[PDB]
Amino acid sequence: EKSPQRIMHIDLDYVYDENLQQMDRNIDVLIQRVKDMQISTVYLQAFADPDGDGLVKEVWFPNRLLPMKADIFSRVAWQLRTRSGVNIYAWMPVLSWDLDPTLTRVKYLPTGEKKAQIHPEQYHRLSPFDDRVRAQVGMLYEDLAGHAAFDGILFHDDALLSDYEDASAPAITAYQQAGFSGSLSEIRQNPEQFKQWARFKSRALTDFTLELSARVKAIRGPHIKTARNIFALPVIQPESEAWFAQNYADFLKSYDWTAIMAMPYLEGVAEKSADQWLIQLTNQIKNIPQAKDKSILELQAQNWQKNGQHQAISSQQLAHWMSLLQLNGVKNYGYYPDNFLHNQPEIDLIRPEFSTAWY
Numbered sequence: 001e002k003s004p005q006r007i008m009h010i011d012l013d014y015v016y017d018e019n020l021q022q023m024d025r026n027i028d029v030l031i032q033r034v035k036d037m038q039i040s041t042v043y044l045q046a047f048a049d050p051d052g053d054g055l056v057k058e059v060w061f062p063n064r065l066l067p068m069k070a071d072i073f074s075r076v077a078w079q080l081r082t083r084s085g086v087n088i089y090a091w092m093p094v095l096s097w098d099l100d101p102t103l104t105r106v107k108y109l110p111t112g113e114k115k116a117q118i119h120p121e122q123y124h125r126l127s128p129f130d131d132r133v134r135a136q137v138g139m140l141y142e143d144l145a146g147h148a149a150f151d152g153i154l155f156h157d158d159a160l161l162s163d164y165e166d167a168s169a170p171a172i173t174a175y176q177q178a179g180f181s182g183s184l185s186e187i188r189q190n191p192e193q194f195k196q197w198a199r200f201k202s203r204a205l206t207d208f209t210l211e212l213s214a215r216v217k218a219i220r221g222p223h224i225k226t227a228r229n230i231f232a233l234p235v236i237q238p239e240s241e242a243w244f245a246q247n248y249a250d251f252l253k254s255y256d257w258t259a260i261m262a263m264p265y266l267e268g269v270a271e272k273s274a275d276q277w278l279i280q281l282t283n284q285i286k287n288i289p290q291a292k293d294k295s296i297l298e299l300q301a302q303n304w305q306k307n308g309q310h311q312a313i314s315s316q317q318l319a320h321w322m323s324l325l326q327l328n329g330v331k332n333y334g335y336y337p338d339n340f341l342h343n344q345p346e347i348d349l350i351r352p353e354f355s356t357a358w359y
């Protein structure tokens with residue numbers, strides 16, 4: 001994988017159409033767009049998410065467990081790899097799958113309540129402490145690996161847990177068997193165990209992803225690259241591992257690429273403070289020897305409303321941020337999401353700051 005890495009992060013929800021001929025034209029336009037961009041890598045959505053409801057009910061590949069909305073992942077992948085000149089990473093949820101109801105869901109323990117619950121504002125995650133969950137998610141990854149060819153796996157940012165999670169029974173048993181003492185509420189507020197507990201959960205998530213990676217590699221070979229999305233707070237504010245169960249140093253050690261969600265508006269940063277926020281983030285990375293060499297800075301090309309009516313970020317703004325990264329010594333970056341239907345971001349405005357091939 002020759003450097004710098006320049007990544008387009010792409011949803012196939014945009015490509016899908018009930019009319020097959022329209023879908024064909026859509027795929028053709030997408031392939032040409034990526035070819036024209038002249039960058040290195042596409043992170044390609046393997047699951048359907050038309051509603052942004054934080055739960056995958058259908059996917060883009062044949063498989064044993066979930067409905068296939070359309071057989072298009074493998075078709076788009078091989079064309080991008082041979083016509084558009086890019087590596088392809090299959091972008092897959094780690095936990096947020098709409099599987100058999102008897103599979104354990106991640107739960108949290110509400111303050112002042114005795115029974116654990118599922119928080120409506122989080123990804124609808126299955127518990128990584130349930131071995132049946134590990135097996136069935138494993139099956140989905142094996143099914144993708146069997147039917148499509150690709151160069152890497154991008155593990156979704158839904159591999160996270162808060163400081164009130166996971167409160168489910170198998171998680172409780174796992175903590176007990178690992179030597180943790182007391183209820184979840186006692187552990188999280190125990191000065192002598194709460195840090196160990198956060199790290200235990202971070203390692204549990206990472207180990208689960210490495211298990212999934214091993215299953216794919218058994219099928220497609222050892223050459224498969226791994227990437228995982230990490231939230232910005234665990235990078236800039238490491239104590240936040242306590243409520244993310246993500247550890248930046250761990251990601252750097254465990255994956256070929258750590259894809260940092262360098263998205264200031266997502267993080268609630270004001271428009272006039274976003275540049276400084278990005279400079280602070282990149283300064284933090286550069287202070288960790290060779291972190292920049294294994295990290296991708298992923299910029300946002302939309303401003304999301306937890307409601308659902310997302311707003312585009314201007315092409316000029318995105319190009320400005322890409323320029324900012326380069327001027328601050330960062331060579332590996334990309335953006336999410338791409339919208340081929342509307343040329344958003346505008347390829348002519350983005351290319352000179354994004355493609356090394358630009359003249």
Ligand SMILES: CC(=O)N[C@@H]1[C@@H](O)[C@H](O)[C@@H](CO[C@@H]2O[C@H](CO[C@@H]3O[C@H](CO[C@@H]4O[C@H](CO)[C@@H](O)[C@H](O)[C@H]4NC(C)=O)[C@@H](O)[C@H](O)[C@H]3NC(C)=O)[C@@H](O)[C@H](O)[C@H]2NC(C)=O)O[C@H]1O
Pocket residue numbers: 162163164231233243266267
């Ligand atoms: C006094 C004061 O206000 N200062 C505190 C300071 O002590 C502390 O740093 C922060 C955070 O405290 C910890 O917050 C944990 C998370 O709280 C939940 O955050 C939800 C929003 O999360 C954001 O989500 C976006 C993605 O959509 C992500 O990009 C972003 O980084 C996230 N932000 C953070 C900070 O994580 C929010 O909607 C939830 O309501 C909120 N839930 C709760 C229970 O607060 C929390 O789980 C920790 O317990 C809490 N513990 C500490 C810091 O002791 O808060 C400052 O205000």
